[PDB]
Design a protein around this nucleic acid. Sequence first.
DNA 1: ATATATATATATATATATATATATATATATATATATATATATATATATATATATATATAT
Length: 86
Amino acid sequence: SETRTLQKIREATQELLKYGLLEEASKPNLYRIVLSHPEEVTRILEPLDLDIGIDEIRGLLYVKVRLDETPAQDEWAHPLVRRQRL
DNA sequence: ATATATATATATATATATATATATATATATATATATATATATATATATATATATATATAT
């Protein structure tokens, strides 16, 4: 009935959230599709305060916190991204 | 009446079959012990959220 996001883009976004990154080395089909539709993925992630940073040289995409531009908070805090200390 | 032969009471010797007693060897069941893997539980360090205590500040 109503419009649905393209199946491949949905798969790429779900994979990117699950594993936290894509790579042309081991997932070319999704990685290329994401680069061919950056405005769709960035629109999908913006409501959650997530945003993809892309490293074309090394063939990599990774999620990162999209929080405000240096607000009064000097360090970011995000509900979903639980921080760790190895 | 004499002479012969046989029979009755009891035990012993020999054989037959049944049954028990003894011993051994075996198979079986079982208890048990071990090992493996897995799950579970506790302790420590750190990040996160909640709650309380203290102080400031408005209204009487």
